[PDB]
Design a protein around this ligand. Sequence first.
Ligand code: CL
Ligand code: CL
Length: 162
Amino acid sequence: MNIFEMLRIDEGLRLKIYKDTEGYYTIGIGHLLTKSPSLNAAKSELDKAIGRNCNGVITKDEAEKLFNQDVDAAVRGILRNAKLKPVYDSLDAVRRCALINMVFQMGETGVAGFTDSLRMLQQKRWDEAAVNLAKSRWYNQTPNRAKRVITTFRTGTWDAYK
Ligand SMILES: [Cl-]
Ligand SMILES: [Cl-]
């Protein structure tokens, strides 16, 4: 199991503009297009992003291209983040995937907001961190996906995804 396969399981793949769980316009593998309520604004962002007139639909390849960019951006953002970098450096490879997953979903700033959870992960207090992570809007809104990520941090294995 690797980061790409983990996120593909958590986000799914759709080739036509859809609304994410928060009601925002998205496409492919969790690629947010716009927070705007306008389908048209979504369509324009989508075309800007692909370099073609897509009229709200893309190919598998295009979706995978966007996915490669987004995972790269997520990893590079963690490494530039003064609060995220130290945690990431302190983790094992599986747990590292779990933090990349949160960042892809919530953005760098959102994850950096989990102060106490971050401190506990860096200290390797697995069980404590899992309990604190669950006390969040994130957990209440997408509980199945959150539990999966949380189990990953808690155990250090890919069990939740197997
Ligand atoms: Cl809560
Ligand atoms: Cl969920």
